[PDB]
Write a protein that binds this ligand. Structure first.
Ligand code: CLA
Ligand code: CLA
Ligand code: CLA
Ligand code: CLA
Ligand code: CLA
Ligand code: CLA
Ligand code: CLA
Ligand code: LHG
Ligand code: BCR
Ligand code: PQN
Ligand code: PQN
Ligand code: SF4
Ligand code: SF4
Ligand code: SF4
Lengths: 141, 153, 29, 80, 90, 742, 73, 63
């Protein structure tokens, strides 16, 4: 399945705060979260203060991914509304982040390959002396 | 009518536009400061900045220093001011060496409030900062000497 | 008293300035 | 980044995944437990190391483990 | 009425010069030449660093080694007779 | 339509809930699996918000709770009066207030504690009290132990009535939410009925009982020989002998000839020379005027008739260009959230207690109070502490509102939102001003210490070197001293002797009050005060403003008001909760108040208190060393702490020995807190694992599993023992010092 | 100080200070090369313990030497 | 394996109830289940949990 496209949709109503983007957005990376609201309504900003989401498509730029998943969590939990978010680099490149494969990570979905899964109980990790002078950790085996 | 608005219209940039931040008087004032002369040689800026700073620096050293109540107050204070000028020039120098590589281009903004492109400040380059520091040293010492002259000669 | 007037400001002011500048540049590189 | 590992004592209650504040973990198909699923950590580059996942895990001992490792701007939770 | 543009990431992330003016040099041309010729030696940061360190140390050493007794009580030394220690010790 | 609204029998009265610990919480009611349960039971006992979502039930709970508190206080007052009647030297003290030490506690003779019953005078042996009850009782016109007994009985009765009122208004007739929400009516009744009629009727007691009996006492007549208070009401001839105005009855009052009443309603100011206290005539007039003011003030808000303001109207009327909607929405917030109210009221009540401390030192309202240095020092310190604590509480509950009750989607306010939108600027600015203040106050002290140590006193900041004069405060002093002649013509003297100009009031050979000089040292300490207060504000305000979210923790609000952290991630997030900010703010409040009370103690002992010789020679307790000693940390270390701790450290073998014991005990508890503050519960849990093993080996392991304290409780225990220790130390120090050399 | 107060408070404070710096003119021209953060938890324990120990030792040394040599027994 | 309600000793070293005894609730017959032996304990662990899954080699039927 192909990821969601990212157009220029209007941003929520807000008078502006001091909790928004900084130089990190300019030099390193920032983030963008989009959602579709049934009506105009008030929501609390992750960066502090109250804003108004418009009806239809909404696009909000945040400084951290955690802020994005926080806002999105509040959207899905309180306003019963689906959301997505991407990471954006200064060169213009956009990386689709969440939800990765179109399905929320809470519920299982075929197609996902395991990462960092050790097929052994945690107590069966080797002692540090077993990995001395190697680059390996007892949990990397 | 309202007084406080989002920075340059963007409500999601981490700042606000107030009479303190953006009003004609303060805007004109700051834009005419040697630091914001973004289209002129950093050398001259350095001369102005250093001149003013050394000049003010002469004051508190002379009157508050350990030899304030001696016939050798001005000499001592002005010398100390020159010393701080040297030290700060050293600070500026190592700042320049550490922050800018000789190859790296300007890290200054290349846009205006309106959004049009413009030539980035050459103050944020290795050569530019080196010139600025030279200006701060020359102007600094010169300002100390000048203030001392006005005060005791 | 002769030498101390030379060595004390040398070790107390010049040396730590040189060392701090050097270490600064080293750590920033 | 920090390191996050899942062990086969996992019973797939999915509690850790819905506890992560930065979307690091997810559930994948598995046959080792009745729930037919196991946790996974494909996005530890976004991991901050808060350990809410570990506080959410029911198993004894933990089936999810967070080893704080190399420190990055994302793992430090910085916004500047 | 939007603030997101991939082609213009500059305006998107507020990378603006708030107070930088494109105005030409308002300074004195003669003084400009004066400073551009006389302050030039200090515009090389390595040479300036060496000069400030070595010269500063040299100056400090000078004023220190030749400090008058009327300025520093440490160079003037004691002027009163020494007092005896607690247990009759010198 | 404001009216009496009540539900009948909401809760059945039964001991069934008494036999079920933690009934209020579904979690705690289930019983203990670990020992943690126990602590929780006490931690959430009065957190009614975590009990129910219903605002009404909570409101009822708080109402009856308040009744319980008032009951306790009445029982306390009852105790004080009874001990003043049965176990005291009060009458003897009345006979000779200047040479008898106030005592109203006696100890039983066992294990040698009998020594605590010291020679307080009046042929009595006991513990010298510093609460100041004797001067109150003298001011109220009380002369016998019988009257104290009667007041005790009255207070006990009132305790019973308050308790019954609690039970009644919780179990039998419990007010509706609309009733509690009638804020216009509550404000009217509290302004006019409580304060107004309170000071009016009190002015009644003062004019009919206090004034005459005190006039007699001051005349010198034996207390037993003084006419009983009821006689001054029955026989107007006596009052007429004392104040001829009463010969014309209440006629000059109604005829507006108020000038005739200048006999007992004066406006002299200053202090009564033969008592060292404010003029009781001035006090009676004060309470009368205050009564009028509050009485008319209680008719401001609209209730059941057209006249009167609406709170919401006044709020919604105030909105500017900088603030947009202004105070709109605040009425709804302040009529649905107990925590917001508690915040405001705690801040203001604390501040009030502070102003009470200052005003009571500088304008002694009770007879023979100013010369009872022990009592004055005690009162100042006490009320200062109470104030600081209440203020910290204000921060706590502000934050608690911020987490639990704040909802911008239903109860929005523009001011709060705008505050939240520039919180970074506020906190950063407070930060900077704190660093600046710290440098330019403490740095002056370190500067002085260094110059003094290097043999360069001419380079110090002092009155004899580089001067830093409190010019502004000096100007205010001079202005207030010259006021009686210019801007307050009807006033005879100044409002306080402490102003820059004036004479000197002494009683019984001791100095009551004199003009307080302000120099470089005072500039220094005042800026220390500004610094410490600013830091405390920094911590607390940062705590409440970032209680909901930060760039570090975007969803902090969901973690609650009280939680240890959000893990070692993000570099480490310990103490991010607003509760932890209350926790740190407590330490800083302790700091500030400590240096404040030290300031008061040293200044008073140095430049004010002391004995006065004939011809006017004043010898102060520490001989005016403040101006020269308080300018270095070493001066406080040696001339204040070291020098004055003498009395406490050699109090053994005397009646003041309990203060030595408490000195050591407080030091101990203080150090003991550091174990909790410096450590963490992991270590303790593992140690507990080993000990539990040992208990299992001998079949004596408890079913309620021994658990280390939670992180938060570790912090709470820490700060509690820290405060108790430090404060009790300064307590013992102060009391032993001032009782011995006073 | 380092032993009683812990990290998060300081981290958030420093965040507000970072904002402060990026929004202050003239000072804006100067920028850090290493992002300012609060000391780590363990680092805090170590630095706190170090101040504690140094204070301990120096205080007792000063008392020892001064009290003893002030009278020389 | 052991029967339901059987008293078993815990052999998993990293368990809160290691070297202690618990009661068997149910054993999963699915051979793919890595830890079938469901055990319940008299005392809760540091996570307020009273039940845990173990393998056949992690329990020891005793009495
Ligand atoms: C923090 C408080 C503080 C203050 C105000 C002072 C002040 C002073 N010290 Mg002291 N000192 C201090 C702490 C302080 N000290 C501490 C803690 C120590 C122990 C380490 C010392 C140890 C010490 C020694 C050994 C000596 C001094 C000396 C002095 C005097 C000369 C200092 C000097 O030449 O600096 C130069 C002064 C400046 C560079 C002034 C800069 C500040 C300006 C005003 C900033 C202006 C900003 C502006 C208002 C903002 C708006 C800008 C806009 C208008 C454009 C001066 C009175 C000397 C002395 O002999 O005193 C008699 C001296 O020998 N100090
Ligand atoms: C190694 C132990 C040691 C210590 C603690 C001191 C301490 C002192 N010396 Mg002495 N010094 C030493 C060895 C030492 N010295 C030796 C072996 C010589 C013969 C070369 C001298 C020759 C000397 C002179 C002529 C004078 C002093 C003076 C002093 C005093 C002022 C500091 C100074 O300027 O000296 C400067 C010290 C030197 C120039 C010699 C040290 C060079 C060695 C070989 C290298 C040391 C590197 C060092 C270990 C690096 C540490 C920093 C690093 C960990 C970051 C101070 C009490 C001054 C004084 O007495 O004033 C009252 C002074 O005038 N020293
Ligand atoms: C440990 C080494 C060390 C030494 C040798 C000194 C020496 C001195 N300090 Mg001190 N100082 C130090 C560390 C030291 N400092 C530290 C760690 C602190 C912070 C706690 C201070 C805080 C302090 C303050 C606040 C003040 C001093 C002052 C002084 C001067 C004494 C006052 C006087 O009458 O001289 C006479 C001084 C003069 C007649 C003027 C001196 C002019 C100098 C010599 C010109 C040097 C120029 C040159 C470019 C310096 C570059 C050096 C660099 C490259 C390494 C003296 C030169 C006082 C001072 O500086 O007075 C002006 C003073 O007010 N110090
Ligand atoms: C806060 C107010 C207060 C305080 C701090 C004190 C303190 C004191 N009183 Mg005072 N007293 C008070 C109010 C107070 N009293 C009041 C209002 C009255 C009028 C009734 C009195 C009448 C009074 C008398 C007549 C005497 C004292 C005495 C004392 C001293 C010894 C107390 C003692 O050993 O009792 C005795 C100890 C006990 C009774 C211990 C039994 C505790 C039980 C076992 C606890 C059981 C728990 C249970 C839940 C509580 C009962 C609940 C109940 C509803 C059933 C002590 C300084 C004595 C004194 O000063 O001698 C010189 C003394 O003779 N008091
Ligand atoms: C006298 C008969 C009586 C009986 C049988 C009850 C029974 C009940 N009350 Mg009621 N009530 C009463 C009188 C009574 N009350 C009185 C006199 C008041 C006014 C204070 C109230 C006001 C009231 C409120 C506000 C609430 C109740 C509640 C309850 C129910 C649960 C309370 C409980 O079990 O904890 C029993 C509590 C204790 C055993 C502790 C007593 C605490 C005392 C009074 C505080 C003072 C102690 C003081 C600080 C001493 C400390 C000394 C030193 C160690 C520091 C229970 C049905 C609660 C309820 O219904 O919840 C749904 C509830 O919220 N009552
Ligand atoms: C607020 C409480 C209070 C109370 C309960 C009283 C009560 C009394 N006052 Mg007092 N009075 C008060 C405050 C009070 N006063 C104050 C604040 C002042 C200063 C203005 C006075 C000035 C005053 C004077 C000059 C006189 C009284 C008198 C009286 C008595 C007769 C009043 C009467 O019955 O008239 C009838 C009641 C109405 C018409 C209603 C009565 C005991 C009279 C008195 O003492 O006679 C023996 C009297 O001559 N009062
Ligand atoms: C105006 C009075 C007032 C009222 C009605 C409240 C009410 C409340 N506070 Mg607040 N608060 C106040 C003032 C007040 N506070 C002040 C002055 C401070 C500063 C210290 C605070 C700081 C504060 C914090 C940090 C917290 C609260 C919390 C609460 C809530 C739960 C309280 C509870 O159940 O603890 C039960 C009561 C106790 C456990 C009492 C024990 C306290 C110590 C151990 C006693 C101190 C020892 C004593 C002085 C001497 C001991 C002698 C001897 C026994 C050794 C409750 C709504 C909590 C909350 O969660 O709110 C939602 C919470 O976390 N308050
Ligand atoms: C004191 C200055 C003062 O009272 O300003 C008053 C200024 C303007 O207030 P308004 O007239 O907008 O207030 C109207 C209503 O909100 C209150 O009646 O408030 C601010 O804009 C914040 C200023 C903070 C300045 C930094 C501190
Ligand atoms: C100390 C104490 C106590 C006691 C108390 C008391 C004793 C009180 C009293 C009180 C009182 C005893 C009060 C009274 C009041 C009264 C009043 C308040 C009145 C008023 C009146 C009026 C205001 C009038 C008016 C009028 C006029 C003027 C004319 C026209 C007509 C009329 C009538 C309307 C107790 C035991 C609690 C406890 C302990 C402490
Ligand atoms: C000492 C210490 C402990 C240990 C302190 C404990 C466990 C307090 C409990 C001690 C009391 C004495 C246990 C309760 C006793 C019972 C009430 C039984 C009473 C028996 C009668 C004889 C009274 C912590 O748990 C802790 C947690 C987090 C940070 C720091 C610390 C910390 O410093
Ligand atoms: C005050 C404080 C800070 C703030 C302190 C900071 C950010 C350190 C700032 C120090 C400045 C930069 C230099 C101080 C001067 C030192 C003497 C420099 C020594 C350098 C050595 C290499 C010699 C924390 O970050 C912290 C973190 C975790 C627990 C407690 C605390 C804590 O208490
Ligand atoms: S640590 Fe915090 S962030 Fe990293 S994975 Fe576990 S939960 Fe997600
Ligand atoms: S919490 Fe422990 S058990 Fe539940 S899923 Fe995450 S890992 Fe598997
Ligand atoms: S509080 Fe204890 S647990 Fe929570 S972060 Fe700080 S250290 Fe780690």
């Amino acid at each position: 399945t192909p990821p969601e496209l990212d157009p220029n949709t209007p941003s929520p109503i807000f008078g502006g705060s001091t909790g928004g983007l900084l130089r990190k957005a300019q030099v390193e990376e920032f983030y963008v979260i989009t959602w579709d609201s049934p009506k105009e309504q008030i929501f609390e900003m992750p960066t502090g203060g109250a804003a108004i989401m418009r009806e239809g498509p909404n696009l909000l730029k945040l400084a951290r991914k955690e802020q994005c998943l926080a806002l999105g969590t509040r959207l899905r939990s309180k306003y019963k509304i689906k959301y997505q978010f991407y990471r954006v680099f200064p060169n213009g490149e956009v990386q689709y982040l969440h939800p990765k494969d179109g399905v929320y990570p809470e519920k299982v979905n075929a197609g996902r390959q395991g990462v960092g899964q050790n097929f052994r109980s945690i107590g069966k990790n080797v002692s540090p002396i077993e990995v001395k002078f190697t680059g390996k950790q007892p949990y990397d085996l | 009518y309202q007084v406080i608005q989002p920075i340059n219209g963007d409500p999601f940039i981490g700042s606000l536009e107030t009479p303190v931040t953006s009003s004609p008087l303060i805007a004109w004032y700051l834009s005419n400061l040697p630091a914001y002369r973004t289209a002129v040689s950093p050398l001259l800026r350095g001369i102005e900045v250093g001149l003013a700073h050394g000049y003010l620096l002469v004051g508190p050293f002379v009157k508050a220093g350990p030899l304030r109540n001696t016939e050798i107050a001005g000499q001592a204070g002005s010398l100390a001011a020159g010393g701080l000028v040297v030290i700060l020039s050293l600070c500026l120098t190592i700042y320049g060496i550490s922050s800018f590589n000789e190859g790296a281009p300007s890290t200054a903004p290349s846009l205006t409030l309106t959004g049009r492109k413009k030539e980035p400040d050459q103050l944020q380059t290795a050569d530019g900062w080196a010139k600025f520091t030279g200006g701060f040293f020359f102007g600094g010492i010169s300002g100390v000497i000048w203030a001392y002259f006005l005060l005791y000669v | 008293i002769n030498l101390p007037s030379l060595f004390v400001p040398l070790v107390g002011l010049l040396f730590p300035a040189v060392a701090m500048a050097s270490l600064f540049l080293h750590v920033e590189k | 980044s920090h390191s996050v590992k899942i062990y086969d004592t996992c019973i797939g209650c999915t509690q850790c995944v819905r506890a992560c504040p930065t979307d690091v973990l997810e559930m994948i198909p598995w046959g080792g437990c009745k729930a037919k699923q196991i946790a996974s950590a494909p996005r530890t580059e976004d991991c901050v190391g808060c350990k809410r996942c570990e506080s959410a895990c029911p198993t004894d001992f933990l089936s999810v483990r967070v080893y704080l490792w190399h420190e990055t701007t994302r793992s430090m939770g910085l916004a500047y | 009425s939007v603030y997101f543009d991939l082609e213009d990431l500059g305006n998107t992330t507020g990378q603006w010069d708030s107070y930088g003016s494109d105005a030409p040099s308002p300074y004195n041309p003669l003084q400009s030449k004066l400073f551009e010729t006389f302050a030039a030696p200090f515009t090389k940061r390595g040479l300036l660093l060496k000069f400030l360190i070595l010269g500063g140390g040299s100056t400090l050493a000078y004023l220190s080694a030749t400090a008058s007794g009327d300025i520093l009580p440490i160079t003037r030394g004691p002027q009163q007779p020494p007092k005896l220690g607690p247990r009759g010790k010198i | 339509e404001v009216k009496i609204l009540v539900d009948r029998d909401p809760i059945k009265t039964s001991f069934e809930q008494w036999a079920k610990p933690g009934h209020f919480s579904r979690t705690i009611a289930k019983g203990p699996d670990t020992t943690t349960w126990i602590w929780n039971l006490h931690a959430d006992a009065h957190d009614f918000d975590s009990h129910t979502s219903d605002l009404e039930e909570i409101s009822r709970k708080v109402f009856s709770a308040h009744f319980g508190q008032l009951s306790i206080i009445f029982l306390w007052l009852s105790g004080m009066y009874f001990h003043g009647a049965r176990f005291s030297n009060y009458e003897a003290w009345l006979n000779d207030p200047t040479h008898i030490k106030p005592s109203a506690q006696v100890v039983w003779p066992i294990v040698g504690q009998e020594i605590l019953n010291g020679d307080v005078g009046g042929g009595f042996r006991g513990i010298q009290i510093t609460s100041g009850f004797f001067q109150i009782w003298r001011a109220s016109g009380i002369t016998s132990e019988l009257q104290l007994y009667c007041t005790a009985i009255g207070a006990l009765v009132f305790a019973g009535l308050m308790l019954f009122a609690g039970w009644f208004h919780y179990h039998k007739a419990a007010p509706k939410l609309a009733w509690f929400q009638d804020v216009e009516s509550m404000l009217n009744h509290h302004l006019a009925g409580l304060l107004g009629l309170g000071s009016l009727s009190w002015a009644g007691h003062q004019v009919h009982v206090s004034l005459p009996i005190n006039q007699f006492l001051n005349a010198g007549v034996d207390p037993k020989e003084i006419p009983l208070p009821h006689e001054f009401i029955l026989n107007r001839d006596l009052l007429a002998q004392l104040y001829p105005s009463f010969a014309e009855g209440a006629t000059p009052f109604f005829t507006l000839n108020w000038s005739k009443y200048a006999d007992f309603l004066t406006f002299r100011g200053g202090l009564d020379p033969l008592t060292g206290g404010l003029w009781l005539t001035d006090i009676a007039h004060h309470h009368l005027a205050i009564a009028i003011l509050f009485l008319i003030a209680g008719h401001m808000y609209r209730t059941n008739w057209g006249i009167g303001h609406g709170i919401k109207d006044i709020l919604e009327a105030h909105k500017g260009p900088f603030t947009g909607q202004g105070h709109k929405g605040l009425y709804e917030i302040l009529t649905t959230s107990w925590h917001a109210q508690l915040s405001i009221n705690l801040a203001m009540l604390g501040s009030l207690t502070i102003v009470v401390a200052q005003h009571m030192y500088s304008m002694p309202p009770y007879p023979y109070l100013a010369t009872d240095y022990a009592t004055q020092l005690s009162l100042f310190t006490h009320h200062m502490w109470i104030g600081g604590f209440l203020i910290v509480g204000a921060a706590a509950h502000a934050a608690i509102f911020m987490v639990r009750d704040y909802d911008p989607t239903t109860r929005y306010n523009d001011l709060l939102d705008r505050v939240l939108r520039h919180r970074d600027a506020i906190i950063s600015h407070l930060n900077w001003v704190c660093i600046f203040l710290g440098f330019h106050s403490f740095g002056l002290y370190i500067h002085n210490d260094t110059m003094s140590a290097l043999g360069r006193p001419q380079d110090m900041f002092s009155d004899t070197a580089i001067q830093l004069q409190p010019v502004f405060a000096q100007w205010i002093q001079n202005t207030h001293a010259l006021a009686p002649g210019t801007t307050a013509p009807g006033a005879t003297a100044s409002t306080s002797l402490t102003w820059g100009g004036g004479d000197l009031v002494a009683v019984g050979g001791k100095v009551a009050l004199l003009p307080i000089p302000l120099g470089t040292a005072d500039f220094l300490v005042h800026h220390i005060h500004a610094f410490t207060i600013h830091v405390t504000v920094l911590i607390l305000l940062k705590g409440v403003l970032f209680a909901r979210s930060s760039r570090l923790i975007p969803d902090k609000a969901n973690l609650g008001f009280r939680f240890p952290c959000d893990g070692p991630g993000r570099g480490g997030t310990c103490q991010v909760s607003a509760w932890d900010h209350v926790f740190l703010g407590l330490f800083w409040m302790y700091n500030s108040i400590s240096v404040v009370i030290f300031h008061f103690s040293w200044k008073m002992q140095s430049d004010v208190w002391g004995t006065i010789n004939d011809q006017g020679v004043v010898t102060h307790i520490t001989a005016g060393n403040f101006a020269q000693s308080s300018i270095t940390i070493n001066g406080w270390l040696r001339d204040f702490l070291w020098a004055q701790a003498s009395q406490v450290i050699q109090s053994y073998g005397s009646s003041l020995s309990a203060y030595g014991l408490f000195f050591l005990g407080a030091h101990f508890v203080w150090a003991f807190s550091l174990m909790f503050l410096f450590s963490g519960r992991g270590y303790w849990q593992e140690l507990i694992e080993s000990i539990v093993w040992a208990h299992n080996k001998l079949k004596v392991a408890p079913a309620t599993q021994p658990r280390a304290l939670s992180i938060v409780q570790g912090r709470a225990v820490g700060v509690t023992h820290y405060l108790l220790g430090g404060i009790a130390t300064t307590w013992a120090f102060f009391l032993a010092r001032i009782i011995a050399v006073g | 100080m380092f032993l009683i107060s812990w990290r998060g408070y300081w981290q958030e404070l420093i965040e507000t200070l970072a904002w402060a710096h990026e929004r202050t003119p003239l000072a804006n021209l100067i920028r850090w090369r290493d992002k300012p953060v609060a000391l780590s938890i363990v680092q805090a324990r170590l630095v706190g313990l170090v101040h504690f120990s140094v204070g301990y030792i120096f205080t007792y040394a000063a008392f020892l030497i001064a009290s003893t040599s002030g009278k020389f027994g | 394996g052991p029967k339901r309600g059987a008293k078993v000793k815990i052999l998993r070293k990293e368990s809160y109830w290691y070297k202690g005894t618990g009661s068997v609730v149910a054993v999963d017959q699915d051979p793919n289940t890595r830890y079938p032996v469901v055990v319940r304990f008299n005392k809760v662990n540091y996570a307020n949990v009273s039940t845990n899954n173990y393998a056949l080699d992690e329990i020891q039927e005793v009495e």
